[PDB]
UniProtKB/Swiss-Prot annotation, chain A:
Family stated for the protein in its record: Belongs to the eIF-2B alpha/beta/delta subunits family.
Gene name per UniProt: EIF2B1
Protein's name in the database: Translation initiation factor eIF2B subunit alpha
Gene Ontology cellular component terms for the protein in this record: cytoplasm; cytosol; eukaryotic translation initiation factor 2B complex; membrane; plasma membrane
Subcellular location, record wording: Cytoplasm, Cytosol
Swiss-Prot record, chain B:
GO terms of biological process kind: astrocyte development; astrocyte differentiation; cytoplasmic translational initiation; hippocampus development; myelination; oligodendrocyte development; ovarian follicle development; positive regulation of apoptotic process
UniProt similarity note: Belongs to the eIF-2B gamma/epsilon subunits family.
Subunit description: Component of the translation initiation factor 2B (eIF2B) complex which is a heterodecamer of two sets of five different subunits: alpha, beta, gamma, delta and epsilon. Subunits alpha, beta and delta comprise a regulatory subcomplex and subunits epsilon and gamma comprise a catalytic subcomplex. Within the complex, the hexameric regulatory complex resides at the center, with the two heterodimeric catalytic subcomplexes bound on opposite sides.
GO molecular function: guanyl-nucleotide exchange factor activity; translation initiation factor activity; translation initiation factor binding
Primary residence: cytoplasm
Post-translational events: Phosphorylated on serine and threonine residues by GSK3B; phosphorylation inhibits its function.
Residues shown, of full length: 242 to 481 of 721
Annotated protein name in UniProt: Translation initiation factor eIF2B subunit epsilon
Keywords: Acetylation, Cytoplasm, Disease variant, Initiation factor, Isopeptide bond, Leukodystrophy, Methylation, Phosphoprotein, Protein biosynthesis, Ubl conjugation
UniProt entry tagged with the keyword Phosphoprotein: yes
Length: 293, 217
């Protein structure tokens, strides 16, 4: 099928269910594209898949999409070169893709189960922007008879924090909203910091919504732990050194341009909660190599 | 004059004989006094050993009962704390926290409640909102309302307390009940199944029991 069908299917899948990330939609679109092929040679199919991934990347500019596409491409073909009939190989790869899609969807519950035991009783928690996995973690924590208070940030320019505040108020939890310029003023009362992630880099740092770097520095100045929640399919191969090493195709969405993302160094992070387990920033270098088979 | 009695002694078989020859002896004090008075012959001397770095006590009335309970809570007798669970019972387990706070299993807590220090909660207890409990022991399976103040009190199993109450230094037995707008002054005792009505204020030293008032009204 052509690119117009690809874009239409992608947008329809995104719009049908709001509780879904871009990566899952991209993976489902790629699987549907795989099921609608007619070729006879493997590398022609490889070229078609690469072109499809490249076209899909141009619509939405997020880090997770490209990494998910690459992981899907190199995970689908562990053993598909044995027989001489195209049909058997195609069936085997379709089965492998279905298995991969099945295995993708169990990460959030594992993350919540591993992370909910780090919250004390009667504690104040700071957070930035909106993230669904953090909400799941908090739901699991409140299901275990614990009490805490939450501070959130308005997170300009789209006021994303108020949405998370409204979602939190539905679970009768004390939640308050502060300004974007009062983070350092309010760090005094906090006890721990939990944020989401948009991509994990080779040296252990992260890429996230603009405004995380200053919060991390302020928390480091007063010796507060910094926790990160992420997923396996968000691992990318990149080794930035400063703020200007980030590729420009991720900074500006499709100074005065207001870049949307920023990078945080591994020396300001305490622990990482992934579906692979609990890893210090030093083990990410090995785990990324092992993952990229 | 700086010795505390533990009521623990090491006795020889001969002691038994001395309790059959003298038909009038009835306690240990009588035996000690008789031995210390008659210094003629046989089985005369008595010795004492004094310790300094261990613990030992006996319970004989309410005052010493309260003192011993307070000493036990604060880990003064420790090979044995509430966390140890030396009884090997499945219904008596707890977790230790800061400021000497012990929490049993499944116990639920409301919003705004504050526990100061030296508190024990049994399994199944339910607590409302905006309470204040200090230096108290609560048995298993008790229901407590809202805006309740407990200070140096002791509650046993299956006791229900209504909202808006103030209690100080009192003991409650099994299956007691207290209605609303009740204030118990220090040193109050309630026996089994005793119920106290609302809008009352008992004076100090009150004792209430379901048995005949002084041994059908």
């Amino acid at each position: 099928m052509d690119d117009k069908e690809l874009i239409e299917y992608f947008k329809s899948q995104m719009k049908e269910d709001p509780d879904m990330a871009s990566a899952v939609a991209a993976i489902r679109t790629l699987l549907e594209f795989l099921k609608r092929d007619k070729g006879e040679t493997i590398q022609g199919l490889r070229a078609n898949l690469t072109s499809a991934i490249e076209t899909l990347c141009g619509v939405d500019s997020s880090v997770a999409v490209s990494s998910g596409g690459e992981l899907f491409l190199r995970f689908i073909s562990l053993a598909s070169l044995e027989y001489s009939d195209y049909s058997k190989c195609k069936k085997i790869m379709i089965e492998r893709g279905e298995l991969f899609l099945r295995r993708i969807s169990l990460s959030r519950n594992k993350i919540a189960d591993l992370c909910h035991t780090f919250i004390k009783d009667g504690a104040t928690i700071l957070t930035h922007a909106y993230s669904r996995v953090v909400l799941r973690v908090l739901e699991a924590a409140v299901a275990a008879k614990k009490r805490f208070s939450v501070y959130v940030t308005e997170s300009q320019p789209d006021l994303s924090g108020k949405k998370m505040a409204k979602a939190l108020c539905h679970l009768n939890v004390p939640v308050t909203v502060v300004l974007d310029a009062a983070v350092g003023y309010i760090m005094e009362k906090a006890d721990l910091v939990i944020v989401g992630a948009e991509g994990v880099v080779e040296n252990g740092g992260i890429i996230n919504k603009i405004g995380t770097n200053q919060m991390a520095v302020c928390a480091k100045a007063q010796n507060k732990p910094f926790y990160v929640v992420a997923e396996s399919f968000k691992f990318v191969r990149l080794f930035p050194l400063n703020q200007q090493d980030v590729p420009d195709k991720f900074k500006y969405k499709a100074k005065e341009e207001h870049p949307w993302v920023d990078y945080t160094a591994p020396s300001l992070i305490t622990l990482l909660f992934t579906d692979l387990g609990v890893l210090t920033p030093s083990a990410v270098s090995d785990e990324l190599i092992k993952l990229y088979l | 004059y700086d010795l505390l009695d533990c009521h623990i002694s090491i006795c020889s078989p001969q002691v038994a004989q001395l309790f059959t020859d003298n038909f009038d002896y009835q306690t240990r004090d009588d035996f000690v006094r008789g031995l210390l008075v008659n210094e003629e012959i046989l089985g005369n001397q008595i010795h004492m050993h004094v310790t300094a770095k261990e613990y030992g006590a006996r319970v004989s009335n309410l005052h010493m009962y309260s003192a011993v309970c307070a000493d036990v809570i604060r880990r003064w007798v420790y090979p044995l704390t509430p966390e140890a669970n030396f009884t090997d019972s499945t219904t008596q387990s707890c977790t230790h926290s800061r400021h000497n706070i012990y929490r049993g299993p499944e116990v639920s807590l409301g919003h705004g409640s504050i526990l100061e220090e030296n508190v024990l909660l049994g399994s199944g207890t339910v607590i409302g909102s905006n309470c204040f409990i200090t230096n108290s022991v609560i048995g298993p399976g008790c229901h407590i309302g809202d805006n309740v103040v407990l200070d140096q009190t002791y509650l046993w199993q299956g006791v229900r307390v209504a909202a808006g109450a103030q209690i100080h230094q009192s003991l409650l037995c099994d299956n007691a009940e207290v209605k609303e707008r009740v204030t118990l002054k220090p040193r109050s005792v309630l026996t089994s199944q005793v119920v106290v009505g609302p809008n009352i204020t008992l004076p100090e030293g009150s004792v209430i029991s379901l048995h005949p008032p002084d041994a059908m009204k």
